[PDB]
Design an enzyme around this catalytic site. Structure first.
Site, mmCIF file in Angstrom:
data_model
loop_
_atom_site.group_PDB
_atom_site.id
_atom_site.type_symbol
_atom_site.label_atom_id
_atom_site.label_comp_id
_atom_site.label_asym_id
_atom_site.label_seq_id
_atom_site.Cartn_x
_atom_site.Cartn_y
_atom_site.Cartn_z
ATOM 1 N N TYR A 1 10.652 25.584 -8.748
ATOM 2 C CA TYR A 1 11.594 24.476 -8.921
ATOM 3 C C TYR A 1 12.906 24.967 -9.489
ATOM 4 O O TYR A 1 13.973 24.660 -8.950
ATOM 5 C CB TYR A 1 10.995 23.416 -9.835
ATOM 6 C CG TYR A 1 11.904 22.211 -10.050
ATOM 7 C CD1 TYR A 1 11.992 21.206 -9.107
ATOM 8 C CD2 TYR A 1 12.686 22.098 -11.207
ATOM 9 C CE1 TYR A 1 12.831 20.086 -9.323
ATOM 10 C CE2 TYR A 1 13.535 21.023 -11.405
ATOM 11 C CZ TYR A 1 13.594 20.011 -10.474
ATOM 12 O OH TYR A 1 14.392 18.899 -10.709
ATOM 13 N N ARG B 1 14.165 5.083 -4.571
ATOM 14 C CA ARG B 1 13.653 4.864 -5.923
ATOM 15 C C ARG B 1 14.313 5.890 -6.831
ATOM 16 O O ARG B 1 15.049 6.763 -6.374
ATOM 17 C CB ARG B 1 12.125 4.985 -5.993
ATOM 18 C CG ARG B 1 11.623 6.427 -6.025
ATOM 19 C CD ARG B 1 10.090 6.524 -6.036
ATOM 20 N NE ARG B 1 9.632 7.855 -6.454
ATOM 21 C CZ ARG B 1 8.353 8.227 -6.549
ATOM 22 N NH1 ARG B 1 7.378 7.379 -6.271
ATOM 23 N NH2 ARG B 1 8.050 9.457 -6.949
HETATM 24 N N1 NAD Z 1 13.840 12.732 -13.113
HETATM 25 C C1 NAD Z 1 14.397 13.772 -13.782
HETATM 26 O O1 NAD Z 1 14.205 13.951 -14.990
HETATM 27 C C2 NAD Z 1 15.246 14.775 -13.008
HETATM 28 C C3 NAD Z 1 15.939 15.714 -13.764
HETATM 29 C C4 NAD Z 1 16.824 16.587 -13.151
HETATM 30 C C5 NAD Z 1 16.996 16.528 -11.789
HETATM 31 N N2 NAD Z 1 16.296 15.629 -11.068
HETATM 32 C C6 NAD Z 1 16.483 15.589 -9.568
HETATM 33 O O2 NAD Z 1 16.891 14.293 -9.202
HETATM 34 C C7 NAD Z 1 16.437 14.027 -7.854
HETATM 35 C C8 NAD Z 1 15.674 12.721 -7.839
HETATM 36 O O3 NAD Z 1 14.526 12.845 -8.714
HETATM 37 P P1 NAD Z 1 13.729 11.544 -9.190
HETATM 38 O O4 NAD Z 1 13.163 11.779 -10.538
HETATM 39 O O5 NAD Z 1 14.565 10.351 -8.917
HETATM 40 O O6 NAD Z 1 12.558 11.594 -8.111
HETATM 41 P P2 NAD Z 1 11.662 10.467 -7.431
HETATM 42 O O7 NAD Z 1 10.449 11.192 -6.975
HETATM 43 O O8 NAD Z 1 11.464 9.316 -8.402
HETATM 44 O O9 NAD Z 1 12.534 9.962 -6.214
HETATM 45 C C9 NAD Z 1 12.841 10.876 -5.152
HETATM 46 C C10 NAD Z 1 13.097 10.093 -3.889
HETATM 47 O O10 NAD Z 1 13.373 11.038 -2.820
HETATM 48 C C11 NAD Z 1 12.536 10.740 -1.720
HETATM 49 N N3 NAD Z 1 12.298 11.954 -0.939
HETATM 50 C C12 NAD Z 1 11.424 12.970 -1.230
HETATM 51 N N4 NAD Z 1 11.331 13.881 -0.288
HETATM 52 C C13 NAD Z 1 12.214 13.439 0.687
HETATM 53 C C14 NAD Z 1 12.551 13.935 1.966
HETATM 54 N N5 NAD Z 1 12.001 15.034 2.526
HETATM 55 N N6 NAD Z 1 13.458 13.241 2.691
HETATM 56 C C15 NAD Z 1 13.967 12.114 2.177
HETATM 57 N N7 NAD Z 1 13.717 11.544 0.997
HETATM 58 C C16 NAD Z 1 12.825 12.257 0.294
HETATM 59 C C17 NAD Z 1 11.278 10.114 -2.319
HETATM 60 O O11 NAD Z 1 10.558 9.373 -1.334
HETATM 61 C C18 NAD Z 1 11.885 9.254 -3.437
HETATM 62 O O12 NAD Z 1 12.244 7.951 -2.972
HETATM 63 C C19 NAD Z 1 15.652 15.274 -7.412
HETATM 64 O O13 NAD Z 1 16.492 16.199 -6.710
HETATM 65 C C20 NAD Z 1 15.242 15.898 -8.745
HETATM 66 O O14 NAD Z 1 15.054 17.308 -8.648
HETATM 67 C C21 NAD Z 1 15.437 14.762 -11.639
HETATM 68 O O1 F45 Z 2 10.581 16.153 -12.997
HETATM 69 C C1 F45 Z 2 10.701 16.616 -14.126
HETATM 70 C C2 F45 Z 2 11.982 17.243 -14.552
HETATM 71 C C3 F45 Z 2 12.300 17.301 -15.908
HETATM 72 C C4 F45 Z 2 13.500 17.833 -16.328
HETATM 73 C C5 F45 Z 2 14.373 18.305 -15.386
HETATM 74 F F1 F45 Z 2 15.568 18.821 -15.777
HETATM 75 C C6 F45 Z 2 14.091 18.289 -14.025
HETATM 76 O O2 F45 Z 2 14.950 18.796 -13.082
HETATM 77 C C7 F45 Z 2 12.878 17.749 -13.611
HETATM 78 C C8 F45 Z 2 9.568 16.523 -15.107
HETATM 79 C C9 F45 Z 2 9.000 15.297 -15.414
HETATM 80 C C10 F45 Z 2 7.933 15.269 -16.291
HETATM 81 C C11 F45 Z 2 7.456 16.454 -16.820
HETATM 82 C C12 F45 Z 2 8.069 17.643 -16.456
HETATM 83 C C13 F45 Z 2 7.545 18.958 -16.901
HETATM 84 C C14 F45 Z 2 6.828 19.092 -18.086
HETATM 85 C C15 F45 Z 2 6.277 20.305 -18.449
HETATM 86 C C16 F45 Z 2 6.452 21.419 -17.639
HETATM 87 O O3 F45 Z 2 5.976 22.640 -17.982
HETATM 88 C C17 F45 Z 2 7.172 21.297 -16.448
HETATM 89 O O4 F45 Z 2 7.330 22.370 -15.630
HETATM 90 C C18 F45 Z 2 7.713 20.078 -16.091
HETATM 91 N N1 F45 Z 2 9.125 17.682 -15.620
#
Ligand code: NAD
Ligand code: F45
Ligand code: NAD
Ligand code: NAD
Ligand code: NAD
Ligand code: F45
Ligand code: F45
Ligand code: F45
Ligand code: GLC
Ligand code: GLC
Ligand code: GLC
Ligand code: GLC
Ligand code: NA
Ligand code: NA
Ligand code: NA
Ligand code: NA
Lengths: 255, 255, 255, 255
Positions: free
Chosen positions: D150, D15
């Site tokens: 994080y 996902r």
């Molecule tokens: N969504 C954002 O705004 C955002 C921003 C910056 C970075 N990221 C990074 O992008 C990546 C994906 O985030 P996302 O928003 O798609 O998250 P999400 O929670 O929507 O999806 C993460 C997926 O990884 C799987 N997963 C979790 N733990 C696992 C494990 N131990 N082994 C295997 N699979 C595992 C979950 O089941 C899920 O399908 C993460 O590394 C997150 O830190 C996200």
């Molecule tokens: O997963 C999130 C995220 C958001 C931005 C990123 F760059 C990232 O690596 C992860 C996310 C999603 C929704 C809300 C927040 C957030 C909002 C307020 C906060 O103080 C916080 O620590 C996280 N972070």
């Protein structure tokens, strides 16, 4: 006595950040030459501070700068530090409202005046194993809205600082810059006064920093004295004096 | 007297960079608590320096750190600055020669020991409007060969410094890091001694800097005193003390 | 067909990196206007590539650029991407051998020519929700020896890219830069030929990258096509195409 | 056909960003192994996409990862790219509400799971001259409030990427990271739902970018395909996919 027996030139030293730097170096035991294109502030500072003298000098005028350097050496016998602080921020300007002409004029002050003084001073800095401190800006690193020419000039200063640090390292001359964020100065006050709501502009400016206030000239001055007097293994660094403005997310679903 | 009346804890203060930081803070008028897991160096430092005392403490052991903080408050009545310097660089190790186990152990020291002391100290730092100084490394920013776990830990410290600076800014507590480059210390000497040609290793290490020498603990100490005592508008910054190693092209046609 | 139906202007497109960018955009289905102050290379490219046409234009001459934009719109009906690649590196020059005059001339090409074309193109880019790609340099970020004016100009371009990205974001126009490292081009070949040992210079240049070779114009071209065609959430970024030159310690005890 | 004949493993591919990356690589002609600790999303994706298969694997469990690699080689005969996307953001947590325990658990997922898969895959990537793509975060570079653990983990990933790029460059294996900003995903939706005003939280999140929207998984996927298939002179880079969030001043007089 952290910088006793030393001779420092501060450009744009008559008010604002430059005046704070002048005061910090005087307080550290140095003799300071205040360079400014305006007489009002710098002349008063000379009367106020034993150890500081004022020399009228527009850093965009090469013969003015040549005289600044020769007069500093004639009067004080050495030169240890040049602080290139003179600079200006124009009023906010949309990209299409800027001109190549205004851009060239801003490069003359913010970039080439720093280049010119540094060039003329470097033979004396080599003799003293002295150093260069350029006052750049945070927005050279992260950008700013309605300020394309200003941002460009400060990106140039920060980059130039690193190039010159490489070239001058074999000769023992360090070259560093300070990148302030919002510092409460007469320029900040003047620009805010042009805005439709000056008080909202100042409030926004205080709150752009996690610390919740703007910085003071004296805080930039302390960083400059550190770089001159105690940072003997620092060259080509960009020292941020910003209150944390560059950190985190702010005010700047996927369709 | 730049930091007179203040109380500082320095972890890993018994030798190397930490000992240089201890000396710098003592020279600034502060009382210093030297934390180290080894008695030899830190006990001698306590005898040498009026104003410094030694407390045996392994920063990886939570109850050791709890006692460090409570003993500092019991003996001196306040806490103004924590310098998280304790850390280690393993010998050079190819990626395939590292283990998750060794990686976890290095995270415990270089990252989580800094986290733990900071957490326990922050209630007292809030009362004093004090500050945190973490000792990271240049290689967290630019990488290093044969050092995947070490680099990872220092990237974490630098990033954590910025996160905590945001969280603690409303409370007046600044959080900054210093990123040294090659500093001549007992660790640098020990690692060089393992190499097949130790003298070539040291020569390479001096020449990796444009300044052509390694840095000294006293130079890191000065930067720490600056951050504690004079950098009141700096939070979340990474202060580079590297001799310019990150600048320019080095030794690291289109087919 | 990644960028089919689109119209791209590439300055300095007659040879080197610019020619690689032209070829990459043609291969992506775009129509390309090759701008160059020299006829030789760009005219041959027009004959070689269906979909590319050559327009003689010196980016330092405002009326040349005005004609470039109006002719692009007259001939093709739209404008989607401007790639500001035209630029020059002077021979290595010690700081004291540079002049304010040469510095101004290099700013005219490397910085103000990019500013001028961007300004004149932006009304059409707004209509097409197009984008700007500036070719900066790694050395704007990390410095370079014997190149104070060049480094300064590229620091300016990278900073300007971020400022303009902020200003143009409400209008859907993205603004990004590419910072190449050592790319094997006719300029690299010309400068090496001036050195006392050209073969040693080229060897040093290949080995400054962890990948152990210089980059190719086609690799910069691919990054440009990515930024134009697939990077719809990227604005104000600096995309490094350097072979890892900025990573780690190289060739650039504590006394 | 940009990446035809190639074999890609995407962790956390069931996902969110990971699923977008899976789709992008399938669309590029690659065969994709979807790794996820959850069956629901990844199994449906396998049924939907010819060329994608699902393997249940928790990246924190070393024997799970060993089986992931051996099964990929058994089924497809080669391995060209590993995308370490699996990771998690905890709910917002004040520094004093975090624990060393939770910090260790988050390091196990966000950092050590990436380390473990990379280690086990690298012998096969060497044979194929393949590459590694780590999904880090913008906040590793600039910090974030209420997220000390994080942020720390993502600073580590970005730093580790550069270290490993240095170590693997002699063998032709590139190692890069993508640092997304706010991307609309199920995690973003889940965290917003915990906040007292979820709609205000989402609105703030869209407006933290100059582009005024959040990013899409497909945009991260495109950047990953670029890094795998066309970025042959890029190693150790941090590719920002943030909508410009890091640019300029926002919401984060001198007394
Ligand atoms: N969504 C954002 O705004 C955002 C921003 C910056 C970075 N990221 C990074 O992008 C990546 C994906 O985030 P996302 O928003 O798609 O998250 P999400 O929670 O929507 O999806 C993460 C997926 O990884 C799987 N997963 C979790 N733990 C696992 C494990 N131990 N082994 C295997 N699979 C595992 C979950 O089941 C899920 O399908 C993460 O590394 C997150 O830190 C996200
Ligand atoms: O997963 C999130 C995220 C958001 C931005 C990123 F760059 C990232 O690596 C992860 C996310 C999603 C929704 C809300 C927040 C957030 C909002 C307020 C906060 O103080 C916080 O620590 C996280 N972070
Ligand atoms: N105030 C801030 O928030 C801020 C932030 C970042 C960087 N800066 C930089 O700090 C420096 C000082 O800014 P400030 O706010 O103190 O400005 P200011 O306008 O209050 O003071 C600038 C001083 O420089 C002098 N000066 C101007 N042009 C000159 C010339 N040609 N020759 C000699 N002197 C000249 C002025 O007369 C004045 O005394 C500038 O380089 C500015 O870009 C300021
Ligand atoms: N020396 C360099 O070139 C260099 C460069 C960049 C960063 N650093 C960092 O500077 C710091 C100091 O390095 P150094 O060269 O002075 O090292 P060092 O080995 O010479 O001294 C480290 C000190 O910390 C102590 N220590 C180790 N583990 C400890 C623990 N669990 N609890 C308490 N004390 C502990 C040691 O006993 C020693 O007294 C480290 O964080 C290191 O990563 C060093
Ligand atoms: N080659 C490298 O290693 C390298 C590295 C980093 C950045 N860059 C940058 O990439 C760009 C291209 O460099 P290159 O190595 O391909 O150079 P090059 O000299 O091989 O080609 C530059 C082209 O621009 C044209 N040009 C020059 N001045 C012009 C003007 N006033 N108007 C129009 N066209 C003009 C030239 O005629 C030539 O065709 C430059 O901006 C340079 O700074 C190059
Ligand atoms: O001089 C100013 C300044 C502010 C911050 C800086 F980092 C800097 O180098 C300069 C300043 C002062 C008051 C208002 C503004 C300002 C406000 C809105 C703008 O759009 C803008 O371009 C500038 N800048
Ligand atoms: O402790 C060292 C160090 C060196 C530089 C740093 F920035 C740092 O944080 C730590 C050090 C000392 C002596 C040799 C080395 C070294 C040499 C070759 C290597 O491949 C390596 O990983 C480390 N590092
Ligand atoms: O054009 C060159 C170049 C090289 C690298 C760059 F990043 C860049 O923007 C430009 C180039 C080509 C050949 C030699 C050199 C060079 C070598 C030694 C020098 O001291 C120097 O200033 C430049 N530069
Ligand atoms: O004009 C704004 C401010 O400029 C400088 O900071 C002055 O030192 C200060 O007194 C004044 O309030
Ligand atoms: O052991 C290497 C060095 O470590 C520290 O820098 C000591 O202060 C110095 O005396 C010694 O030479
Ligand atoms: O002149 C040096 C090089 O310039 C460009 O890269 C050309 O595409 C290449 O054919 C040539 O070898
Ligand atoms: O759940 C939030 C979002 O997650 C992912 O981006 C899905 O692709 C999208 O359909 C959904 O709206
Ligand atoms: Na006086
Ligand atoms: Na004592
Ligand atoms: Na043609
Ligand atoms: Na399938």
């Amino acid at each position: 006595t952290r910088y006793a027996g030393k001779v420092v030139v501060v450009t744009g030293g008559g008010r604002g950040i430059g005046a704070g730097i002048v005061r910090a170096f005087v307080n550290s035991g140095a003799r300071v030459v205040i360079c400014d294109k305006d007489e009002s502030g710098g002349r008063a500072l000379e009367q106020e501070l034993p150890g500081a003298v004022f020399i009228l000098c527009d850093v965009t005028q090469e013969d003015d700068v040549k005289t600044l350097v020769s007069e500093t050496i004639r009067r004080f016998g050495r030169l240890d530090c040049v602080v290139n602080n003179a600079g200006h921020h124009p009023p906010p300007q949309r990209p299409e409202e800027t001109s190549a002409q205004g851009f060239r004029q801003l490069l003359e002050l913010n970039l080439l005046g720093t280049y010119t003084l540094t060039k003329l001073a470097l033979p004396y800095l080599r003799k003293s194993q002295g150093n260069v401190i350029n006052i750049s800006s945070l927005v050279g690193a992260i950008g700013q809205a309605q300020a394309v020419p200003y941002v460009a000039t400060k990106g140039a200063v920060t980059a130039m600082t690193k190039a010159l640090a490489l070239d001058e390292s074999p000769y023992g001359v360090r070259v560093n810059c300070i990148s302030p964020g919002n510092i409460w100065t007469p320029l900040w006050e003047e620009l805010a006064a042009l805005m439709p709501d000056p008080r909202a502009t100042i409030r926004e400016g205080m709150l752009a920093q996690p610390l919740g206030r703007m910085g003071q000239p004296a805080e930039v001055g302390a960083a400059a004295v550190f770089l001159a007097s105690e940072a003997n293994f620092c060259t080509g660094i960009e020292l941020l004096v910003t209150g944390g403005a560059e950190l985190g997310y702010g005010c700047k679903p996927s369709g």
